[PDB]
């Protein structure tokens, strides 16, 4: 079955069903990833190193500010998550490069 | 080997090393979870239903707005992630119960 069969928050993009197909185009509100990341998703060779700087589900849940709003027949859940990374973290420069790569 | 040996964004809380130990106390900037969730972390019996409404790491990477600010010797990365859940989603009411649960503790009846 396709990733579009799943709720948007459970999708995992790959070459076969990519970031554009699962989510949408890169834009200022959806801003991570160069064209390699977009095309290949979690299959991109840089993804495992990038994933060292992504919170896990427990951390997202317990260490976020979470808010809600009604939008038509949905409830919009906003997770605002902050993490403090040392400037000498080995994985930080690679991740900074991917922030708004679509504009760079 | 303590979860405190891992970066704060990769910790997984349990009764042994709970939410307060791994993260910090519930407040308005860290607002999810009742006292059972706080005590038992991912081993709380309510957690799997809550997990149905938490994005995965690839969804959070590719489907958030991400920014950075310098804070001294560190860089703060902010993820702001928005998801639309159908009002008839059967897992939604449990999630909502947990939002700022610290404001609404159980009365003690015995």
Curated annotation (Swiss-Prot), chain A:
What does UniProt say on post-translational modification here? ADP-ribosylated. The ADP-ribosylation is retained in the virion during infection. Phosphorylated on serine and threonine residues.
Q: Domain of life of the organism in this record? A: Viruses
Annotated region (Dimerization), positions in chain? 3-104
Basic residues bias locations: 3-12
Q: Where in the cell is it found?
A: Virion; Host endoplasmic reticulum-Golgi intermediate compartment; Host Golgi apparatus
Q: Where is the CoV N CTD domain?
A: 1-104
Regions annotated as coiled coil: none
Q: What does this protein do?
A: Packages the positive strand viral genome RNA into a helical ribonucleocapsid (RNP) and plays a fundamental role during virion assembly through its interactions with the viral genome and membrane protein M. Plays an important role in enhancing the efficiency of subgenomic viral RNA transcription as well as viral replication.
Q: How does it assemble?
A: Homooligomer. Both monomeric and oligomeric forms interact with RNA. Interacts with protein M. Interacts with NSP3; this interaction serves to tether the genome to the newly translated replicase-transcriptase complex at a very early stage of infection.
Similarity annotation? Belongs to the alphacoronavirus nucleocapsid protein family.
Q: What is this protein called?
A: Nucleoprotein
Recorded source organism is: Human coronavirus NL63 (HCoV-NL63)
